Design a protein around this ligand. Sequence first.
Ligand SMILES: *Cc1c(COP(=O)(O)O)cnc(C)c1O
Ligand SMILES: *Cc1c(COP(=O)(O)O)cnc(C)c1O
Lengths: 413, 412
Amino acid sequence: MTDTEVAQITDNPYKADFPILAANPKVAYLDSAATSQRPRVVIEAQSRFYETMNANLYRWSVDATAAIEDARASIAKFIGAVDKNDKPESQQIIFTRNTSEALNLVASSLGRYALKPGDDVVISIMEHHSNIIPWQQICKATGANLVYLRMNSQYQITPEEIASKITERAKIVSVTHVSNVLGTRNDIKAIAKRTHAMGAYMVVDAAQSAPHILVNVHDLDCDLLAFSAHKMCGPMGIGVLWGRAELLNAMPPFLTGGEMIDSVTETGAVWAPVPEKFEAGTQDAAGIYATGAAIKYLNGLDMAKIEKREELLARYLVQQLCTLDFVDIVGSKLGQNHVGAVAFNVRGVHPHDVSSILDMNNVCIRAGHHSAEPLLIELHESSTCRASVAFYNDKHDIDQLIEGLNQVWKIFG
Amino acid sequence: MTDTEVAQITDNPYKADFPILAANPKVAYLDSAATSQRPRVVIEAQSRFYETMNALYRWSVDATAAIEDARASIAKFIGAVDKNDKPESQQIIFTRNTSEALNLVASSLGRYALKPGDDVVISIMEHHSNIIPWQQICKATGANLVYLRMNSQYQITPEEIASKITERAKIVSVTHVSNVLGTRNDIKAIAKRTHAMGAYMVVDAAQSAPHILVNVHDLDCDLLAFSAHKMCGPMGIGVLWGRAELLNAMPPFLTGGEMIDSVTETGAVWAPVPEKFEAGTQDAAGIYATGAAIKYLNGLDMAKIEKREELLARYLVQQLCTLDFVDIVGSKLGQNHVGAVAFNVRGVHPHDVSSILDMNNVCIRAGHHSAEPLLIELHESSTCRASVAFYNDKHDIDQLIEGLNQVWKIFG
Ligand SMILES: *Cc1c(COP(=O)(O)O)cnc(C)c1O
Ligand SMILES: *Cc1c(COP(=O)(O)O)cnc(C)c1O
């Protein structure tokens, strides 16, 4: 890393936007892969909704409706879901609680729609649990087979592995865009091309890519894409599912009840149009509003500027972890091959000990399986530490982790 | 109504706790049956969580402790306490809303208990979220969807209860309070017949939890669901309570992270209840603010809240009855309304009534109120609905009555 690159991450022009970070200047929060800290403008936007337009034809409900629709449009534009006139395709944005529910919705609705016995559902060994178990469940129910894309020695899914596992039997392919443990960026567009050539649907878990890299559903050629707002400076409780307009109309509803209907009788019901077809009951309008505020915040900061800073932070994190001979990185030792997350272990020390000591030094990391236990079994690991970076981190935060790990070794080495 | 009762609802010792009402003194919000307004302390608790403990490090331990305190508060609020009065926090499951909890129950309890030929019994009063999940699970299991009907006084009689809940019944799911009629159903009595038939009792408490005392042990229900946003909590938080043995027997609903104990490539071992039913990152801040709403409601005393809202409902029905051009959809006795009063201005579409009322800063709901099978039973296509909460007052209701006269002047 050059003198200038290190200088760029020594400066921190973003940390002050976050009240919890400004109020706790000694704390080095390196667990953004789990959830983000909240920008002040996102917190006040949620409180502002509840104070000024809280409603579920009167004026408050009309404003709340307009605030929701503007948030759908902002989210659609953020992931490139725009029509030929750049008009955002807001009606292809479906709100959930998190990525987990969106993937449950997809596996249930798309699985019932498309899966026949003998079909193949292809996922990767890097998948988060929420992109595994809904497929275990629906495969057993439809008679379909669950197929796994494996990695090579460099934690990558090769084109040969893509063509070897995605065969004619494939009906659904659901792959994470970025691994929440390895930080590998998977070639989603290339996987989609093979997936479509075999007549299958492409689902993308973008929970770890939406906060860090450019997401464009049209350039990615995916049929469905899901992510969580709380991982990109939005509030908790809001997940997003984008869907190809024709596919969402064919897909059957997931949750049923109020607000997803057009009419109901004692014995049947007629479904509402998309996206209302997939949103049952009272939605979190304030959380949706605050998510739109998060998009406007990220837009104003420039995602290209965010990505550039987060590549440098990731490289500095991997580079500085590599100077500790008692640290084994779980993944690539090349920082540029890490988006966000860097998994590692202090040799012979359980991650629970590493994390407990690091918190005594005001360092927040994640320890355990990281909801990717099949991946860890593949790599012969019971548990790992995981440090993750966001644009509001800086060089000092990483140095504080490195100094904290020397204190871990001094105690457990 | 006595002279003191009118003076009681004339004074309003609560609405100043709600920033949107204090900032808009001219607005008469009578749509609390759709959603509550937020007390200041509930809004600040949500902001406070994100500013102070948003997350084995300190912030995560604090957020874990804050979430568990909220479960305990919610369980004690609905009387879910053990034999030592300790709240049964592990029987509280968080959803987005009542709708998702009812979808969870219908899917998980239906798969666990429904056999072909079994009866699922609901009532004609049900909200759509307590209808369609039963339509769906019945079509899949070969069960029958049976309806408890009303008498001429909008009540479910003991005779109808015994007639419809028969030996073939496996699941009974009835609303505690109608979101259109305001009728309070005898949930304890329905559960008695339900359990004698060897069936499970499910309660939609979305319209009762904010108004009347809910005690899961006195109601004898097996599962109960409600929404926090209808009881001064934030949106996005729903609550499902269940008997501990029943929640263990019930299969998971959503699957994925956080609800497991271990995972392999081909299978998974589930976490214990309630984590078994909570997949992925939960809305910890909304959970925290929901506990703050419980603390706020506890400080006001439900017995005081119910007593005030009973007076407001009586005044609303009494005043609506003074208009010859208003037809109440439901009982004409105000004490038979919990919260909600549905009505129609003769010959005027509810959309017209609501448009004019908004010009007069009156907020009501117009349409089907997500209870279309009920309106079809009552030969209505659409109605207005005004609803009362403790932070309403006599002025709000009078403003509605005056606005209704402006409606008749324009469309009568
Ligand atoms: C509002 C309502 C529901 C649904 O509540 P949501 O929060 O919208 O899911 C269920 N039952 C009754 C009686 C209701 O009034
Ligand atoms: C965090 C994560 C999920 C689950 O996200 P939730 O918001 O907790 O539902 C899914 N996939 C990946 C890659 C993740 O990192």
